[PDB]
Each structure stands twice: as structure tokens, then as C-alpha cells.
Design a protein around this ligand. Structure first.
Ligand code: ZN
Lengths: 148, 238, 232, 121, 384
RNA sequence: GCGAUGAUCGGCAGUCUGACAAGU
RNA sequence: UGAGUAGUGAGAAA
């Protein structure tokens, strides 16, 4: 049987009419450094960037990467376990975080992706209606979220 | 459209136990376990076979949330002939009787319902169809009717309840076989009307993952119904 | 008529008693045995102690007992029980009289047309006489009409449409026709019909006929020899 | 537990009867049990109103049997004389029906009351 | 630490012994989970010690409710008593935590377990089903579930035979069958006895009466004054047939038929008497049943007419659901309700409709409303 | 001393044929 | 020998 995946009902051409405040945002592992490195707090750099209440989300795969890092990145590990950061369970064998994040956004058009990886960012860019959050300069920046 | 005296060509559908009636319009149909009657007034197709007159029932996507699902093209349906199925939220025989058609004589349908008044007709329908076992009981406490049900190959939940995830897990934990079938009908308005539909579906998928059900597929049910998706998963005990 | 009517009542009893125990119809198919069970046991609880040996063999009687406890039917009041028993009393009774009428009929044939009963039989002989309306009326008919007596619809349909005519008629159900096979059935029908006429004219028009059926006996013997050589 | 159930309170009954009078003026109201039955058969009824003081109550219990079969909200009011009054008819009314019309000039309050009736159920 | 397991099945109660205890820390490992699915491995874990089938359907329904409500039945108490040693404390695996307190109360010496380890074994026992009793007679579990289930379901629904109206529908579909059928056989009795002396077929047109007189008057020759009185008692002498038959029997052309022929007529006539006798019995039962189920409808129009209307609708629930106009045309083919006459029929149809509503949605219908409702029709009747 | 618990509008249709058949 | 067993729905009376 042939498969033609149905484009999500949350999408009108290129604008997602479903993503709305309070936003749910997936945290990428590299985001934590450029947050710590820039002295930008996770919860509120998001609020300042998006001017809304933001619910950060750490999946098992991104989490699984973090402890593998080791003592050098303990600060990143502890901030990941801040109780304000909710946890997402995963039911796929692989621990590669980039693939897991790309799948979740493919599945449901309700997440913001917080990452600075060029390769991952390009993959998310191809997927329509996925707001992409990044940290540059002094604070966070959101590109595909016109409600801003 | 499909008038009384019209002649149609019946052909099988990709899923076993589901047949397609062709014509100027196409009707997706199921063989009648109890020929000669309609359960909710549905149109019936009769075919002469060597000659016995086998009957078929039309299967309205605007009435059964399952039916709109197959119209949308679900990849995998655990509901198949000669399989045990556990139907939750069996308000009446509108959809159960058709699920009974697919499973056939060899399988059975465990129809679970709570509210007494719709249950009465479910009992009445169960009389014509030997293979349904209606269980007028609140699904939130599967301990009550553990007596009546063994293992089940697939569990279907059409329950419109905000805590519908919990009911599925408890029922699946008891009677669903390892690697069994899970097919859920979700209405976000009943669960959380404050947030948008897509947020709700992601949340429901999450709770299923917490309960050791691996989701396999989900599909939006438009244009037949609003804010509805059917999630298909497999119960992975280990 | 009795055959038709006992069937309809049997259907009603199966449906009505099926409400209190729907599983019986599948297990026991005989209508009379179906009624007797209701008479012996009235309610499924009574099944545990009752013995159905005289009505049913061992394997059948135990299956109904197991069905009784795991049944689907609902409980019924004694008022309901009484009248369904009355039906079951009627159902068994018709069978008793139906057998009686069968024996009464056969005795009637062996005195009024002994020769035909020997050749064609009692039941088929009766339908032949009834179709003509009288023994004399049938006696005056040629053997050709007797061969196709009960196939008028097929006969005249064939005659109008320039197609083959029937060859058995009502005589098809006679034992001798059944013994024949293939095209020999048609030949025996012609031979049997002719001999039936010879015997028939004896029964109807013999003033001092001996109630022995002897002319039927050699007439039967001749057809049997024809069947043997034709089949061989 | 009581056969008449759910029964609207003093506050809730007023808004329901308010919609009833507005519907009557706009010919969107079907009055009487027999009419309400017909609307349920046709599937053109937005929701059904009954009086809890019908004498006897049973003669309108067929609407609840119809209602949730067709997934139509319903509710009971304490008074039939009051219900007939708002209906604009000079006689008591034990049951009435609001006809479906998405082009009606009084759509908004109809859905407002319907939402509350659904919550009560 | 699990040594015994309790499993509840529709036939009875099953108690098991855990021969081997699976790894607890390694419970989530795949192989131990695969062991549950595999029958051969599962057999090495547990073994059946006792099975107590229920005596009958009543016990199963009673125990299912007790099992449903987390209670210990007498049957359940027995099988645990016979199997569990008194004993530090014997460990039992139970699917339900709610049962645990009840078991502990009855048996202080048993500690119940319902942890995941127990659930794994419960899952396996339910998994293999009939295979694990080693041929012990438990029927087939799927069919026992069907019979138990509907009783359990009907129980929580409080479904009552009193509300059953199918008996009425069968009575009507049967009563007319008898009426046509009694006519059919009775006519034939007239023909058979008609030859022996035809004139009685003319004298007593009523077929039901005719069979009795044939049963009494088998031979027309037998004519006595005392017999005249006896047949005079049959029916009444107002018609004078008692004198006519005596006179006309003396003087008739009917050819005597054989004793076997006469034996058939009386026996054949005796059949017509029996069905009509039963038909009267069944007709009475219909009237009794209609008063019970639909006193309002039966009182308002009648027991026979109301039953026919119910059968036409297909069920009393259906009739109450129908609108007044629909009810009127339901019986407009047989004129059940029947310009001024037409008005009454429509008016009567409406009253019958609400009368059905009272009966259908009433746990114990009364006839108080039907009486006044019929009285209301009477006042409407006299007005026109 | 009215009414939504309901005013008003017998036909088709005619009872097959008649000396050959089977074997070396 | 050949040869087919989906009525309408507020008036009515004066
Ligand atoms: Zn993951």
C-alpha cells in the first residue's frame, strides 16, 4: 500500500495556526551551553524572546546525551533537572537526539525547537510550520513565529 | 445517490473482513452476521451466491468514528476475522455490530458500556448476534468485570472521557495480549477544551508511551468529524 | 396440510421456547424431540436432574444439559411455562396423529388399489389418484399422461417454446425411478407408467378383484428385469 | 434518581424560558409533546424542554428516550403553566422544541443556554 | 515469595501452586517475559492444585457479584480452606487488591500479594486458558463467559421479565394461526362426517360446536330420548337442532362409513377440540398478560387490539416512541381504531399513544389513568 | 360552561410421441 | 424409440 502522509491540520500554507501561548518548546542539548555560556536563563530568556509563558521540555534522548557528557558539563546536567523543566518519555530504541527531535515535530505541530545546530536547524527548516528558536549574541531569537 | 434498487459491484477491501461496493458512488460494507435486518436503519446489500442470498450492511463514516478512519486510510487495523476484541464505550450496536461483522463467527466482541439506557439496546442487539458479550459496567474499574473476559487480541476505546488514557492502560494491562492491538478514538474538546487540538493529541500520545503502549499510527478524521484523531499502537509489555 | 401446519407450530415453539433457551434448536433439530424436551424439563434449572435418555441419545442429552447452565435464555414465569408446554403437548400430539393417518392411509390403499401400492407405492399412488380426482378418472387416462401427470408447468412450457418435454412427472419419486440412473430413469419412467396403467385398470374396473395385489407383483417383476438388463 | 432529571433551578429556568419566548416570536419554537417528537424524528431540534409537573409525568418520558439517542440536550422546568406562558400559547405546555437554524437572529443565546444544559447533563 | 495463586474463571475457582519463583530484579528482562508467553516455560513455573466448578448458573452470578464487590463467597471460602495450609504466613497471589482485606479477614494466616510479579502470573494463567488444566473439565471458557456475562449485565441493569412484552407478540402471531388452523381442520371434519350424514354440517354451522356433536353423535342410527336430552344439553334447544338431528338422523341419505373411518373422524375431531381449547387458554393468557404489561392500553381499547398494535410497532417501546399520527396509521390497515367517525379515530389514536407511554416507562403500570383516559374518550364520544 | 394532555384543514393455458430398441 | 423434477400545527364557538 502506498503512503502519502497527511499534512497537519494546524497548517495554512506556511503559518501554523495551532502554536499559541503558552508555548511548548523542546530543548536541544547544545542549547544549554549557549544558554550557560551567554549567562542566559532558560525559562525567561524564552519569555523575553517570545513575551509569553514557555514550557521547556527535555526528552529522554536529549537527557540521555547529557549524563554521557561527564563531569565537565555537570552544570548543564543540573539545569536540565530543574523541576520547572518537564520530562518527555521516548519509546524508540535510538538515543540520537537530533533524529528524535525531528520525529516529534513531524508527528505533531505544537513544539518550538530550541537548538543552535546548523544541520538540525536546516532539517527543521524544511518541515513547514515549525518555529525554530536559537540563542545568539546576548539572548534567544525566534525566526518562524510571527506572533512576536 | 445510493437508491434502493441500484445494482452495485462488491469487492474486498485491503483489510480482511471489509468489502467495497462500487458504482457511481462507492460504499464500504461489511457482511451481515444476522441477515435480513438493519440495526440502526442502515441500507443493506443482498447478493445471490450459489442460490443463497447473502446480505451486506452499509457502514456510515458519519456515524462510526472507526468508519471515517478507514475512509481516511489507516495503515493497520488489528480488527480482523477470528480475533478477540474488547470494545470500550459501546453506547449501542451502531459500531459494535459492524465490528462483530469483521471478526466473524470465530471471534467475539466484548462490548463495555456504563449508562443503563443505551445498554438496554446493546443487550437487545446482543441477542441477534451470538459473538458479542455486552458488559454493562464502568470501564474505570476493570476489576469488576475481570471475570467475564480472558485475553483480547485488540483493545478499542471510543470512550469520551478526560481520563480516557487511564481506562485504556488499566484495561490493556489486564486483558490485552503481549504485542496486542490498541486503537483509540480521541476528542480533544472532551479532554481539554482550553488548549488547541494538536496539543491534546501530543499529550495523549505521551500518556500511552508512559503506559508501555508503543504508538504505531495516527490519522485525523476530517472531513467526517472535527478535532478527532485515531491513534493506533502496540502493547509492548517487556 | 398437517405436514405444513406442524412445521409452522414447530417454528413458533422453537422461537418462543428459544427465548428461554435459544441453544436447543441447533442441538436437537427434530421438532417432535424438541417439544418432548420441553415436556420433560420445563426450566433450565430442572435440566440438571431430569433424564432425556428416552428422547435423546447419550451424546446429545449431555450437550443440552451443558448448554442449560451456560445458556442465554431468560427466566420465564410459570404462567408462560404452562402455555408453551401446551404447545409442546400439541406438537407431540400432531406427530402421533400424523403417524396414525399415515397408517390409516396405507391400509386404505392396500384395499382400494393393492396392485399399484406394490408397483409404485402408497404415497405416490395416492398423489396420482388425487391428481386425477378419482380412481376411474386415472384409469381412463393413457400411460403417457400418467408418466408426466405432475409436471404440467414444465410440460407446457416446453411445448410452447419448442424445447424438450419432461419425462418423469410425479412418478420421479417412486422407488424404481430412484434405483435407475442417468438416462435409464426416463426409460424406466415410461416402462413403469405403462405397467401402472395395466395395474390401475385392474384395481378400478375389477368387480371381484382379490385384495392381493398379484397383478402388481408380476408387473413389478417385469420392470425390475427391465431395470437389471438396462442397467447391466 | 427521580424520573424528571436533570431539573433546572430558579436561575437556569429563566434563561431557558427567555429563549423560548424569543423563539416563539421568530417561529422557531415547536410547542407540545407531539410536535417535539416529530422534530426529534427529523433531527431538526436544537434541544428539548419539558415540564416536571406534567400530570402524569410519564406521558412525556418518551422524549428523553429519543433525546440522547439522537444526542440532543434536554432539561426539565418545574412549571408547565409558566412554560406555556412563555411559549405564547393560551394553554399549558408540557414540552416544546427549539428548531435548529444557524441563520437565526437569536442563535447566540440559544447556544449559550444549550451549553449550560449540556453541563447540567 | 509467592507459593499459591488464586484465579477466578466462569466455571469455578482455580487455585495454583508456584513451583518456581521467577527472578524479581530480572522481571523486566525480555526472556522472563517471553517465558510467560511460552506455555512450556509457564508450566514449569506453576501447577494446578484444585478446581471447584460452580454448581449452576445461580452460583456463578452470585459469586461474580461478590467477586465484583471485593467480597468472599462461601464457595470461595471453601476452596481456600481446603487448599491453603494453616501455617510463617502462606502467601497467595490475587488479581484484586480489594479482595485482599476480605481474604485476610476470613483467613488471618494468609498474606495476599497483587504486585506486578503476581500480575505476570495472573496474566499467564489467563493467557493459556483451557490448556493449563491438563484436561480437567472446564468446558470452554469463551462460551461460559457469554452465559455468565449477560446475566451479570442484566443484573446491574435490573432487567425484569415483568417488562418483557415479547410474550404478547408471540401470542398474537400464534392466536391468529390457531384461528385459521382450527377453521382448516374443522372444515375437513365436516366433509368426513358429511358423507355419513351431511345435514348436521348444515344444522350446526358453528364448526366448534359441530365437532362435539360428531364426537357424541358418531352413528346417526343411535337415537334415544335420553341421548336427545344429552345432545340437547350440548348448546341449547332454542335453535331446535336437538329435535332436528333426532328426526333428520332417522331420515337421511348419508352412507355409513367404516369403523376405521369413524375412528378417524372422532380422533380427527378430537384434535380440533384440543387446539380451540388451547386457543381459549392462550387467549386468556394474552388478556392476563396485557393487563399486567399494558393495563392502560388494554383497558383503553382492549387486550386483543392493544396486542396487535404492539406487534405492528414491533415493541411496546417502539409504540411509545411513535408520534400520534404514526400510531393512527399503524392500525389503519386493519381498522384497529375504527367524517365524524374519522375524528374519533384520530382522537382515540392520540389517547392510545400516551397510554402506551405510561405503560412503557412505568416499572409497575397502573390502570387508574387508562380508566379516566377512556372515560375522557367517552365524553368525547357522546359529544359527537 | 373549549383547545399543544392538540382546534383547524376465470386469463396466460394447449393434458407428450407411437414400432422399433439391444447383442454377435 | 424419442422426450426440462416523515401530514399540517392554533385556533374553535359565539
Ligand atoms: Zn527519544
Amino acid at each position: 500500500t502506498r503512503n502519502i502522509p497527511q499534512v497537519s491540520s494546524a497548517l495554512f500554507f506556511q503559518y501554523n495556526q495551532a502554536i499559541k501561548p503558552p508555548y511548548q518548546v523542546l530543548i536541544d542539548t547544545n542549547f544549554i551551553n549557549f544558554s550557560i555560556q551567554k549567562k542566559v536563563d532558560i525559562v525567561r530568556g524564552m519569555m523575553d524572546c517570545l513575551l509569553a509563558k514557555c514550557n521547556p521540555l527535555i526528552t529522554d534522548c536529549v537527557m540521555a546525551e547529557l549524563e554521557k557528557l561527564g563531569p565537565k558539563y555537570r552544570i548543564a546536567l543540573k539545569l536540565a533537572r530543574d523541576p520547572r523543566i518537564k520530562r518527555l518519555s521516548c519509546s524508540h530504541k535510538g538515543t540520537y537526539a537530533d533524529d528524535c527531535l525531528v520525529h516529534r515535530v513531524l508527528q505533531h505541530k505544537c513544539y518550538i525547537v530550541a537548538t543552535n545546530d546548523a544541520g538540525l536547524k536546516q532539517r527543521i527548516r524544511k518541515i513547514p510550520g515549525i518555529p525554530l528558536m536559537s540563542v545568539g549574541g546576548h539572548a534567544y531569537v525566534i525566526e518562524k513565529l510571527p506572533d512576536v | 445517490g445510493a437508491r434502493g434498487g441500484a445494482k452495485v459491484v462488491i469487492e474486498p477491501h485491503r483489510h480482511a473482513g471489509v468489502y467495497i461496493a462500487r458504482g457511481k458512488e462507492d460504499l464500504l460494507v461489511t457482511k451481515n452476521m444476522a441477515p435480513g435486518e438493519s440495526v440502526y436503519g442502515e441500507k443493506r446489500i443482498s447478493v445471490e451466491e450459489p442460490p443463497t442470498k447473502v446480505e451486506y450492511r452499509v457502514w456510515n463514516p458519519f456515524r462510526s468514528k472507526l468508519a471515517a478512519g478507514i475512509m481516511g486510510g489507516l495503515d493497520e487495523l488489528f480488527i480482523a476475522p477470528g480475533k478477540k476484541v474488547l470494545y470500550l464505550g459501546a453506547a449501542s450496536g451502531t459500531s459494535v455490530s459492524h465490528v462483530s461483522d469483521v471478526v466473524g463467527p470465530e471471534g467475539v466482541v466484548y462490548a463495555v458500556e456504563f449508562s443503563h439506557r443505551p445498554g438496554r439496546e446493546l443487550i437487545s442487539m446482543a441477542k441477534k448476534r451470538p459473538n458479542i458479550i455486552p458488559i454493562i459496567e464502568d470501564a474505570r474499574h476493570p476489576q469488576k468485570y475481570r471475570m467475564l473476559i480472558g485475553m483480547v487480541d485488540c483493545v478499542f476505546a471510543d470512550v469520551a472521557q478526560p481520563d480516557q488514557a487511564r481506562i485504556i492502560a488499566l484495561n490493556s494491562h489486564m486483558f490485552l495480549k503481549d504485542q496486542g492491538g490498541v486503537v483509540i478514538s480521541i476528542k480533544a474538546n472532551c479532554i481539554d477544551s482550553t488548549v488547541d487540538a494538536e496539543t491534546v493529541f501530543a499529550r495523549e500520545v505521551q500518556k500511552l508511551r508512559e503506559e508501555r503502549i508503543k504508538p504505531l499510527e495516527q490519522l485525523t478524521l476530517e472531513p467526517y468529524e472535527r478535532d478527532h484523531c485515531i491513534v493506533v499502537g502496540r502493547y509492548m509489555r517487556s | 396440510d398437517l405436514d405444513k401446519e406442524l412445521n409452522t407450530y414447530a417454528m413458533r415453539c422453537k422461537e418462543w421456547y428459544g427465548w428461554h433457551f435459544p441453544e436447543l434448536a441447533k442441538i436437537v433439530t427434530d421438532s417432535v424431540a424438541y417439544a418432548r424436551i420441553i415436556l420433560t424439563m420445563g426450566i433450565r434449572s430442572k435440566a440438571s436432574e431430569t433424564d432425556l435418555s428416552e428422547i435423546l441419545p447419550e451424546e446429545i442429552e449431555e450437550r443440552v444439559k451443558t448448554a442449560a447452565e451456560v445458556s442465554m435464555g431468560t427466566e420465564i414465569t410459570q404462567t408462560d411455562l404452562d402455555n408453551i408446554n401446551a404447545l409442546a403437548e400439541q406438537i407431540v400430539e400432531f406427530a402421533a396423529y400424523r403417524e396414525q393417518l399415515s397408517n390409516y392411509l396405507s391400509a386404505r390403499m392396500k384395499a382400494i388399489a393393492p396392485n399399484l401400492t406394490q408397483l409404485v407405492g402408497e404415497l405416490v399412488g395416492a398423489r396420482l389418484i388425487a391428481h386425477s380426482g378419482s380412481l376411474i378418472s386415472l384409469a381412463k387416462s393413457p400411460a403417457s399422461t400418467i408418466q408426466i401427470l405432475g409436471a404440467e408447468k414444465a410440460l407446457f412450457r416446453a411445448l410452447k417454446t419448442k424445447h424438450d418435454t419432461p419425462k418423469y412427472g410425479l412418478l420421479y419419486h417412486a422407488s424404481l425411478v430412484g434405483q435407475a440412473t442417468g438416462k435409464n430413469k426416463g426409460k424406466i419412467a415410461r416402462v413403469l407408467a405403462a405397467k401402472a396403467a395395466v395395474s390401475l385398470r385392474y384395481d378400478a374396473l375389477a368387480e371381484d378383484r382379490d385384495d392381493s395385489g398379484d397383478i402388481g407383483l408380476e408387473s413389478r417383476a417385469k420392470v425390475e428385469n427391465r431395470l437389471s438388463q438396462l442397467e447391466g | 434518581n427521580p424520573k424528571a432529571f436533570p431539573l433546572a433551578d430558579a436561575a437556569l429556568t429563566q434563561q431557558i424560558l427567555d429563549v423560548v419566548q424569543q423563539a416563539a416570536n421568530l417561529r422557531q419554537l415547536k410547542k407540545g409533546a407531539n410536535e417535539a417528537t416529530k422534530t426529534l424524528n427529523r433531527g431538526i431540534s436544537e434541544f428539548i424542554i419539558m415540564a416536571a409537573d406534567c400530570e402524569p409525568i410519564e406521558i412525556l418520558l418518551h422524549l428523553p428516550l429519543l433525546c440522547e439517542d439522537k444526542n440532543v440536550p434536554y432539561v426539565f422546568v418545574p412549571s408547565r403553566v409558566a412554560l406555556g406562558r412563555a411559549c405564547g400559547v393560551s394553554r399549558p405546555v408540557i414540552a416544546a422544541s427549539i428548531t435548529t437554524n444557524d441563520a437565526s437572529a437569536i442563535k447566540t443565546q440559544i447556544y449559550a443556554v444549550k451549553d449550560k444544559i449540556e453541563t447540567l447533563l | 515469595p509467592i507459593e499459591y495463586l488464586l484465579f477466578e474463571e466462569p466455571t469455578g475457582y482455580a487455585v495454583f501452586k508456584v513451583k518456581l519463583q521467577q527472578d524479581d530484579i530480572g522481571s523486566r528482562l525480555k526472556e522472563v517475559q517471553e517465558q510467560i508467553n511460552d506455555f512450556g516455560a509457564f508450566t514449569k513455573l506453576i501447577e494446578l492444585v484444585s478446581f471447584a466448578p460452580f454448581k449452576g448458573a445461580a452460583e456463578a452470578l452470585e459469586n461474580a457479584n461478590d467477586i465484583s464487590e471485593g467480597l468472599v463467597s462461601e464457595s470461595l471460602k471453601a476452596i481456600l480452606d481446603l487448599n491453603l495450609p494453616k501455617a510463617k504466613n502462606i502467601t497467595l497471589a490475587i488479581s484484586d487488591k480489594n479482595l485482599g482485606p476480605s481474604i485476610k479477614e476470613e483467613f488471618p494466616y494468609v498474606d495476599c500479594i497483587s504486585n506486578e510479579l503476581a500480575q505476570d502470573l495472573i496474566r499467564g494463567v489467563r493467557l493459556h486458558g483451557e490448556k493449563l488444566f491438563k484436561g480437567l473439565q472446564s468446558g470452554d471458557l469463551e462460551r461460559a463467559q457469554l452465559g455468565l456475562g449477560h446475566a451479570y449485565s442484566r443484573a446491574k441493569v435490573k432487567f425484569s421479565v415483568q417488562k418483557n412484552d415479547n410474550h404478547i407478540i408471540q401470542a398474537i402471531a400464534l392466536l391468529d394461526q390457531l384461528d385459521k388452523d382450527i377453521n382448516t381442520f374443522a372444515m375437513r371434519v365436516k366433509e368426513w362426517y358429511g358423507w355419513h350424514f351431511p345435514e348436521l354440517a348444515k344444522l350446526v354451522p358453528d364448526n366448534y360446536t359441530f365437532a362435539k356433536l360428531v364426537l357424541f353423535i358418531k352413528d346417526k342410527a343411535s337415537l334415544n330420548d335420553d341421548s336427545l336430552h344429552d345432545l340437547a344439553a350440548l348448546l341449547n334447544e332454542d335453535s331446535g337442532i336437538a329435535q332436528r338431528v333426532i328426526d333428520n338422523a332417522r331420515i337421511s341419505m348419508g352412507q355409513d362409513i367404516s369403523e376405521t373411518d369413524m375412528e378417524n373422524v372422532c380422533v380427527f375431531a378430537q384434535r380440533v377440540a384440543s387446539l380451540a381449547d388451547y386457543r381459549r387458554q392462550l387467549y386468556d393468557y394474552l388478556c392476563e398478560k396485557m393487563h399486567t404489561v399494558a393495563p392502560n392500553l388494554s383497558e383503553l381499547i382492549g387486550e386483543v387490539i392493544g396486542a396487535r398494535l404492539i406487534s405492528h410497532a414491533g415493541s411496546l417501546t417502539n409504540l411509545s416512541k411513535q408520534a400520534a399520527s404514526t400510531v393512527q396509521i399503524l392500525g389503519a390497515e386493519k381498522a384497529l381504531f375504527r367524517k365524524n367517525k374519522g375524528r374519533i379515530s384520530r382522537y382515540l389514536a392520540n389517547k392510545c399513544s400516551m397510554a402506551s407511554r405510561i405503560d412503557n416507562y412505568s416499572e409497575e403500570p397502573s390502570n387508574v389513568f387508562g380508566s379516566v383516559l377512556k372515560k375522557q374518550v367517552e365524553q368525547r364520544l357522546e359529544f359527537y
